[PDB]
Amino acid sequence: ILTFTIPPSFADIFLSKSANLTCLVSNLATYETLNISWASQSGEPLETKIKIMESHPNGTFSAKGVASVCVEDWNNRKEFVCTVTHRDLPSPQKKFISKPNEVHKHPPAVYLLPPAREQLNLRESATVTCLVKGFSPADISVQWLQRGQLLPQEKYVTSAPMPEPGAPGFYFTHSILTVTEEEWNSGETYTCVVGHEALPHLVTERTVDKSTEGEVNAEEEGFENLWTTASTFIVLFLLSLFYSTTVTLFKVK
Amino acid sequence: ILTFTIPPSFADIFLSKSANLTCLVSNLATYETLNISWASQSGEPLETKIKIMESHPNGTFSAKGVASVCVEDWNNRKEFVCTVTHRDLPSPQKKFISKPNEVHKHPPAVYLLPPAREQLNLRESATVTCLVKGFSPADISVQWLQRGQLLPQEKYVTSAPMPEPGAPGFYFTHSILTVTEEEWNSGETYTCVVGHEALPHLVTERTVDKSTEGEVNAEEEGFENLWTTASTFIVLFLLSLFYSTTVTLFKVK
Amino acid sequence: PCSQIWQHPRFAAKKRSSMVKFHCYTNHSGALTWFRKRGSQQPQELVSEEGRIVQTQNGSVYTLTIQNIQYEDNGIYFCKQKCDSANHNVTDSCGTELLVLGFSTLDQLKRRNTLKDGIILIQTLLIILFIIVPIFLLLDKDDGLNIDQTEDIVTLR
Amino acid sequence: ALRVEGGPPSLTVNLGEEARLTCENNGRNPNITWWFSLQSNITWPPVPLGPGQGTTGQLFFPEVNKNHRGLYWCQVIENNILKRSCGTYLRVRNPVPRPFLDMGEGTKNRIITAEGIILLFCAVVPGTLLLFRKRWQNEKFG
Ligand SMILES: *[C@@H]1O[C@H](CO)[C@@H](O)[C@H](O)[C@H]1NC(C)=O
Ligand SMILES: *[C@@H]1O[C@H](CO)[C@@H](O)[C@H](O)[C@H]1NC(C)=O
Ligand SMILES: *[C@@H]1O[C@H](CO)[C@@H](O)[C@H](O)[C@H]1NC(C)=O
Ligand SMILES: *[C@@H]1O[C@H](CO)[C@@H](O)[C@H](O)[C@H]1NC(C)=O
Ligand SMILES: *[C@@H]1O[C@H](CO)[C@@H](O)[C@H](O)[C@H]1NC(C)=O
């Protein structure tokens, strides 16, 4: 029998503003004596949700204990105890879950890559990818929006964070938004939002579309004055050349 | 006593021009009375080679059955069965096997993607990403080349194969070659190759290298060429003015 | 009474002739007037044009869409409403400050600016030269040498 | 029963430079809050910031970063009365740091046209001087 304690994910933590502890028990021959009770180090009673997963092919069972606690307790590295008294276990098992120790923090650097021209040449489909690189906590949720409307997770995939090469402790991940060529052809604006703990605001957003030259510069160039100078200079070249030729001919006579 | 059937691999078929059907049986208490032979669905016996490895530390022996038959019959999905009998087996362990389910078998479609200009704006590092998508087999080996030399795994990282949305049973992968900022200035050759079973030439490679691959867009550069010709014309006008000035000075002097 | 108007992405950095969808979500029902503001000038009424300003009413929501957007469309966009509640309590929206972006690849701008700096330095040099040419030429034409007969600092002067 | 000035609909600031927000209201000294959000409908509730400083309720970012783009709307509570503002939008642009060449596109292109006109005229006049000189020296030789 192997028992583990699993902290809740970042997505649910931000969604419900209430962390859910886990008391994962495995390899249970019997479940009639199963009892998962959750408590803190001070002994404060707490409600425990008990749910049983499907039986494993080998015949072993599993169960998890869910307890609703505020996220601030997790931020204060508060300790919690799950008490399990099972007939297969010779003695009751006491364990503690808390926030891990201090570790270097780095907010993610989001980067949204547009599809390559070669990919568009097959006129089949487009896969918009936004690279999220350089975050120390692996708990990162990346979503995508279409015209500000949420996109189901069946239309895109997000690779699990993998350690950053050349820099230990940092993690990077990708997210591919496969979009039909008809939808991308209409000048759609596609964005990926990155919810992550180390972010100063806990959430950011990056955009890209057909423009691909979406540099922010307000209005600096492109005015009609450029055309005015071009035309007046064409005239200037003509007059200068004519003047030089007339000067040469007046030197002649 | 567990009997396992190992389908032949394509490597020796490509090299030795023959396929080996392996009937690997482990957890064998004794072998002096073992009788293992290859057979067919229609009862046709096959030539079986018996090869026995050394004793397993758990106290159980093992045996194998090796046969050589033409690849074309195996490509025709003929059901070959390996007969395994032993003194400790109340019933023979006849495992029925054929070609595993062949699928659409489409070759990868590599679309090298350039780094994001926002990332280059930091003047620190750039990631070159080559999306490899649209292949049926799980196995795939992406390697990057630098000036014709293979890039070791110590510098780049690649994502494990994952199913692609919109087409069940269709796989894809990815990759990322971190490069330093002065590496991206130098215009080195960044290319990633892909090894795959379904590739008609067995190897494919895309080329997005140096420091810029180009991008055609909409209007956008028209005033740019207008500015370039305006600068050229200012240059010509300056040259004509200097020529006239020098002629005037020389005639005066 | 009539101050429950909603709006959408306000900054809306866009390239010339691009597409975004406006609306006028509200919790009321009455007369509506689209208004456009540029800079610090006074509010002005918008005029509908097909394929340039699309106006579809989704019940209580007044959808809007502006195609062929140019630099003259830079400014603030919002939808007014009329609240004839026996007090002339006239309320308005908040705003949508549209911006038009210059596409200088954020990099060619440096090259152009360096080039114009070169040309106006060439102005300084050439204008000094062509102001010293006429006097020094009419001195010889009318008929420097006298000053030499009358040292390096004086010549520079 | 109360209103609040919406403030600028958008805002711009250089990277690494301080950005200060604003919340103007008619109240005497009424409860104020900062509720950061994003552009459109996301899956996360608005992120409340700190309480601000001063009577106005002004934010302060001593060293803003690229991640700080988004709406910043201020929340005001005045004796159990709630009212929502409109929301600003922080953003960085990294403007051009080169002011030597007479900042202002129109300025530089106009002085370029003036360059052409004045250079052509001040080159033409020497031609008249040269022809006058040639005539006068030819008269002198005779
Ligand atoms: C309009 O106001 C009522 C009353 O507060 C509310 O129930 C309703 O949801 C509002 N509708 C919208 C579109 O906000
Ligand atoms: C309002 O908008 C929805 C969503 O685009 C659309 O389905 C609906 O038909 C619109 N109202 C109309 C056209 O009556
Ligand atoms: C609008 O309503 C507010 C709140 O009742 C009031 O103070 C203000 O004077 C009104 N404005 C007009 C024009 O009636
Ligand atoms: C609202 O007013 C109460 C009055 O005591 C104060 O404690 C509270 O901090 C105020 N809200 C803020 C500033 O978040
Ligand atoms: C906004 O997002 C939420 C969460 O995805 C969704 O439930 C809601 O329907 C969306 N917009 C509308 C129309 O309320």
Tab-separated table of N, CA and C in Angstrom, chain D residues 17-103:
chain	number	residue	atom	x	y	z
D	17	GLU	N	9.752	52.523	-16.760
D	17	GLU	CA	9.362	53.836	-16.275
D	17	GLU	C	8.087	53.726	-15.451
D	18	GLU	N	7.969	54.592	-14.448
D	18	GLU	CA	6.830	54.537	-13.545
D	18	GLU	C	5.540	54.890	-14.274
D	19	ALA	N	4.474	54.164	-13.946
D	19	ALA	CA	3.142	54.427	-14.472
D	19	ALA	C	2.191	54.605	-13.301
D	20	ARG	N	1.485	55.730	-13.278
D	20	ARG	CA	0.593	56.083	-12.183
D	20	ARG	C	-0.839	56.122	-12.692
D	21	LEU	N	-1.743	55.529	-11.937
D	21	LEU	CA	-3.129	55.491	-12.452
D	21	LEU	C	-3.889	56.682	-11.870
D	22	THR	N	-5.215	56.666	-11.971
D	22	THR	CA	-6.045	57.721	-11.409
D	22	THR	C	-7.459	57.206	-11.198
D	23	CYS	N	-8.122	57.733	-10.171
D	23	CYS	CA	-9.545	57.501	-9.914
D	23	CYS	C	-10.139	58.777	-9.324
D	24	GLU	N	-10.829	59.558	-10.155
D	24	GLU	CA	-11.442	60.811	-9.731
D	24	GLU	C	-12.915	60.568	-9.439
D	25	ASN	N	-13.379	61.054	-8.289
D	25	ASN	CA	-14.761	60.856	-7.881
D	25	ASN	C	-15.224	62.055	-7.067
D	26	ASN	N	-16.542	62.205	-6.979
D	26	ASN	CA	-17.168	63.318	-6.277
D	26	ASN	C	-17.309	63.076	-4.782
D	27	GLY	N	-16.959	61.889	-4.300
D	27	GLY	CA	-17.136	61.571	-2.899
D	27	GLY	C	-16.198	62.354	-2.002
D	28	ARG	N	-16.520	62.332	-0.708
D	28	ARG	CA	-15.718	63.049	0.277
D	28	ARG	C	-14.411	62.315	0.558
D	29	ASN	N	-14.506	61.063	0.994
D	29	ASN	CA	-13.355	60.208	1.249
D	29	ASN	C	-13.802	58.751	1.247
D	30	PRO	N	-14.331	58.227	0.107
D	30	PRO	CA	-15.107	56.980	0.098
D	30	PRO	C	-14.365	55.749	-0.406
D	31	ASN	N	-14.811	54.573	0.015
D	31	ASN	CA	-13.914	53.386	-0.034
D	31	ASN	C	-13.481	53.140	-1.488
D	32	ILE	N	-12.171	52.927	-1.702
D	32	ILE	CA	-11.568	52.753	-3.059
D	32	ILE	C	-10.701	51.491	-3.110
D	33	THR	N	-10.725	50.839	-4.270
D	33	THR	CA	-10.160	49.492	-4.551
D	33	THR	C	-9.655	49.449	-5.998
D	34	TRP	N	-8.662	48.601	-6.282
D	34	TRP	CA	-8.141	48.453	-7.668
D	34	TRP	C	-8.392	47.022	-8.153
D	35	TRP	N	-9.164	46.862	-9.232
D	35	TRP	CA	-9.510	45.526	-9.718
D	35	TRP	C	-8.940	45.335	-11.121
D	36	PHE	N	-7.742	44.763	-11.206
D	36	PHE	CA	-7.129	44.459	-12.491
D	36	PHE	C	-7.887	43.340	-13.199
D	37	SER	N	-7.907	43.409	-14.524
D	37	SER	CA	-8.581	42.405	-15.337
D	37	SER	C	-7.834	42.290	-16.661
D	38	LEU	N	-8.460	41.646	-17.640
D	38	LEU	CA	-7.896	41.498	-18.973
D	38	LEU	C	-8.893	42.025	-19.997
D	39	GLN	N	-8.501	41.955	-21.270
D	39	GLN	CA	-9.270	42.614	-22.321
D	39	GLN	C	-10.655	42.002	-22.485
D	40	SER	N	-10.712	40.683	-22.659
D	40	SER	CA	-12.033	40.082	-22.982
D	40	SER	C	-12.465	39.073	-21.919
D	41	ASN	N	-13.386	38.186	-22.291
D	41	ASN	CA	-13.917	37.189	-21.330
D	41	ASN	C	-12.887	36.074	-21.141
D	42	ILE	N	-12.218	36.053	-19.985
D	42	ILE	CA	-11.234	34.972	-19.689
D	42	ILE	C	-11.862	34.038	-18.650
D	43	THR	N	-11.143	32.985	-18.256
D	43	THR	CA	-11.679	32.006	-17.271
D	43	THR	C	-11.309	32.355	-15.828
D	44	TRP	N	-10.787	33.564	-15.601
D	44	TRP	CA	-10.336	33.949	-14.237
D	44	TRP	C	-11.078	35.204	-13.769
D	45	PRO	N	-11.436	35.316	-12.471
D	45	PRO	CA	-12.074	36.528	-11.951
D	45	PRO	C	-11.080	37.673	-11.902
D	46	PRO	N	-11.554	38.916	-11.811
D	46	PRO	CA	-10.628	40.053	-11.746
D	46	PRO	C	-9.703	39.951	-10.544
D	47	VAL	N	-8.461	40.386	-10.736
D	47	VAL	CA	-7.420	40.272	-9.718
D	47	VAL	C	-7.360	41.595	-8.959
D	48	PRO	N	-7.775	41.642	-7.694
D	48	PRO	CA	-7.676	42.893	-6.928
D	48	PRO	C	-6.231	43.194	-6.555
D	49	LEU	N	-5.832	44.448	-6.748
D	49	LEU	CA	-4.496	44.912	-6.410
D	49	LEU	C	-4.490	45.468	-4.987
D	50	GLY	N	-3.419	46.180	-4.631
D	50	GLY	CA	-3.340	46.819	-3.350
D	50	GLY	C	-4.328	47.965	-3.227
D	51	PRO	N	-4.313	48.628	-2.072
D	51	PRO	CA	-5.328	49.646	-1.772
D	51	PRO	C	-5.038	51.037	-2.319
D	52	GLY	N	-3.933	51.235	-3.027
D	52	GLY	CA	-3.600	52.561	-3.496
D	52	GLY	C	-3.041	53.421	-2.373
D	53	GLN	N	-2.736	54.666	-2.729
D	53	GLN	CA	-2.190	55.623	-1.778
D	53	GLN	C	-2.806	56.992	-2.020
D	54	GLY	N	-2.928	57.764	-0.944
D	54	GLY	CA	-3.464	59.105	-1.030
D	54	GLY	C	-4.980	59.138	-1.009
D	55	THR	N	-5.507	60.364	-0.981
D	55	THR	CA	-6.953	60.549	-0.973
D	55	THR	C	-7.587	60.109	-2.286
D	56	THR	N	-6.915	60.350	-3.409
D	56	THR	CA	-7.426	59.992	-4.724
D	56	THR	C	-7.546	58.487	-4.929
D	57	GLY	N	-6.554	57.712	-4.502
D	57	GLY	CA	-6.522	56.295	-4.803
D	57	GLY	C	-5.692	56.009	-6.037
D	58	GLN	N	-4.458	56.512	-6.046
D	58	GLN	CA	-3.585	56.391	-7.204
D	58	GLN	C	-2.669	55.183	-7.055
D	59	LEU	N	-2.571	54.395	-8.127
D	59	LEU	CA	-1.660	53.225	-8.109
D	59	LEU	C	-0.232	53.734	-8.247
D	60	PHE	N	0.735	52.828	-8.288
D	60	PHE	CA	2.140	53.175	-8.486
D	60	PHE	C	2.897	51.915	-8.867
D	61	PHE	N	3.552	51.941	-10.023
D	61	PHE	CA	4.418	50.848	-10.462
D	61	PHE	C	5.819	51.401	-10.673
D	62	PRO	N	6.690	51.347	-9.660
D	62	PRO	CA	8.034	51.932	-9.813
D	62	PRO	C	8.803	51.396	-11.006
D	63	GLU	N	8.690	50.101	-11.302
D	63	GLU	CA	9.341	49.500	-12.470
D	63	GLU	C	8.323	48.566	-13.120
D	64	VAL	N	7.549	49.107	-14.053
D	64	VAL	CA	6.527	48.326	-14.736
D	64	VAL	C	7.198	47.354	-15.696
D	65	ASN	N	6.487	46.280	-16.024
D	65	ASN	CA	6.997	45.247	-16.911
D	65	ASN	C	5.959	44.940	-17.980
D	66	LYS	N	6.394	44.181	-18.987
D	66	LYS	CA	5.536	43.850	-20.117
D	66	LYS	C	4.299	43.076	-19.674
D	67	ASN	N	4.389	42.335	-18.569
D	67	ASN	CA	3.273	41.528	-18.096
D	67	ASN	C	2.128	42.361	-17.528
D	68	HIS	N	2.346	43.668	-17.335
D	68	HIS	CA	1.331	44.517	-16.646
D	68	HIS	C	0.279	45.093	-17.604
D	69	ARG	N	0.280	44.696	-18.878
D	69	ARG	CA	-0.759	45.166	-19.786
D	69	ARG	C	-2.117	44.607	-19.390
D	70	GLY	N	-3.131	45.448	-19.465
D	70	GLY	CA	-4.485	45.040	-19.152
D	70	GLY	C	-5.256	46.198	-18.554
D	71	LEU	N	-6.534	45.940	-18.301
D	71	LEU	CA	-7.389	46.946	-17.690
D	71	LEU	C	-7.049	47.121	-16.214
D	72	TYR	N	-7.209	48.351	-15.730
D	72	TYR	CA	-7.069	48.678	-14.309
D	72	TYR	C	-8.253	49.565	-13.944
D	73	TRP	N	-9.337	48.950	-13.493
D	73	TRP	CA	-10.496	49.724	-13.086
D	73	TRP	C	-10.583	49.811	-11.570
D	74	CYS	N	-10.923	51.001	-11.093
D	74	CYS	CA	-10.987	51.293	-9.671
D	74	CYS	C	-12.409	51.143	-9.146
D	75	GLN	N	-12.518	50.566	-7.953
D	75	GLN	CA	-13.793	50.268	-7.314
D	75	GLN	C	-13.987	51.240	-6.158
D	76	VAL	N	-15.168	51.842	-6.080
D	76	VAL	CA	-15.463	52.843	-5.063
D	76	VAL	C	-16.677	52.380	-4.272
D	77	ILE	N	-16.577	52.447	-2.946
D	77	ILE	CA	-17.678	52.135	-2.043
D	77	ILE	C	-17.921	53.368	-1.185
D	78	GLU	N	-19.166	53.845	-1.162
D	78	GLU	CA	-19.536	55.063	-0.439
D	78	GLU	C	-20.822	54.781	0.335
D	79	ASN	N	-20.674	54.358	1.591
D	79	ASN	CA	-21.801	54.072	2.480
D	79	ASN	C	-22.744	53.037	1.862
D	80	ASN	N	-22.196	51.838	1.643
D	80	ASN	CA	-22.943	50.699	1.105
D	80	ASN	C	-23.546	51.000	-0.264
D	81	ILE	N	-22.887	51.858	-1.039
D	81	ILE	CA	-23.281	52.160	-2.409
D	81	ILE	C	-22.117	51.794	-3.319
D	82	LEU	N	-22.390	50.973	-4.328
D	82	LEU	CA	-21.370	50.481	-5.238
D	82	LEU	C	-21.525	51.130	-6.607
D	83	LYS	N	-20.392	51.337	-7.276
D	83	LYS	CA	-20.384	51.927	-8.608
D	83	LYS	C	-19.083	51.544	-9.296
D	84	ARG	N	-19.189	51.061	-10.531
D	84	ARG	CA	-18.050	50.554	-11.283
D	84	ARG	C	-17.523	51.625	-12.227
D	85	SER	N	-16.199	51.718	-12.330
D	85	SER	CA	-15.565	52.628	-13.273
D	85	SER	C	-15.492	51.962	-14.647
D	86	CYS	N	-14.730	52.558	-15.562
D	86	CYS	CA	-14.584	52.040	-16.916
D	86	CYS	C	-13.304	51.239	-17.111
D	87	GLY	N	-12.175	51.752	-16.633
D	87	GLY	CA	-10.932	51.012	-16.706
D	87	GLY	C	-9.925	51.570	-17.687
D	88	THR	N	-8.688	51.724	-17.232
D	88	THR	CA	-7.591	52.183	-18.066
D	88	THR	C	-6.989	50.972	-18.782
D	89	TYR	N	-5.836	51.148	-19.426
D	89	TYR	CA	-5.130	50.024	-20.039
D	89	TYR	C	-3.647	50.382	-20.117
D	90	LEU	N	-2.848	49.768	-19.254
D	90	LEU	CA	-1.408	49.955	-19.304
D	90	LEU	C	-0.820	49.228	-20.511
D	91	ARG	N	0.303	49.748	-21.004
D	91	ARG	CA	1.017	49.137	-22.121
D	91	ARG	C	2.374	49.807	-22.274
D	92	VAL	N	3.354	49.033	-22.743
D	92	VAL	CA	4.685	49.538	-23.047
D	92	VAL	C	4.865	49.575	-24.562
D	93	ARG	N	5.753	50.458	-25.033
D	93	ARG	CA	5.943	50.611	-26.502
D	93	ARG	C	7.432	50.762	-26.842
D	94	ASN	N	8.259	51.185	-25.880
D	94	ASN	CA	9.683	51.398	-26.130
D	94	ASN	C	9.884	52.400	-27.262
D	95	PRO	N	9.609	53.693	-27.033
D	95	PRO	CA	9.680	54.674	-28.129
D	95	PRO	C	11.092	54.920	-28.641
D	96	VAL	N	11.213	55.806	-29.626
D	96	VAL	CA	12.491	56.113	-30.266
D	96	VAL	C	13.301	57.051	-29.380
D	97	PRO	N	14.513	56.669	-28.983
D	97	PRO	CA	15.340	57.517	-28.113
D	97	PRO	C	16.248	58.504	-28.835
D	98	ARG	N	16.000	58.809	-30.109
D	98	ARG	CA	16.927	59.610	-30.905
D	98	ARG	C	16.299	60.964	-31.220
D	99	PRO	N	16.556	62.001	-30.421
D	99	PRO	CA	15.926	63.315	-30.645
D	99	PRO	C	16.782	64.336	-31.391
D	100	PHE	N	17.949	63.947	-31.911
D	100	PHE	CA	18.852	64.920	-32.520
D	100	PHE	C	18.229	65.583	-33.742
D	101	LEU	N	17.560	64.804	-34.583
D	101	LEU	CA	17.174	65.256	-35.919
D	101	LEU	C	15.777	65.876	-35.961
D	102	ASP	N	15.529	66.834	-35.062
D	102	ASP	CA	14.345	67.697	-35.109
D	102	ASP	C	13.055	66.867	-35.114
D	103	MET	N	12.807	66.246	-33.960
D	103	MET	CA	11.684	65.334	-33.752
D	103	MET	C	10.401	65.833	-34.408
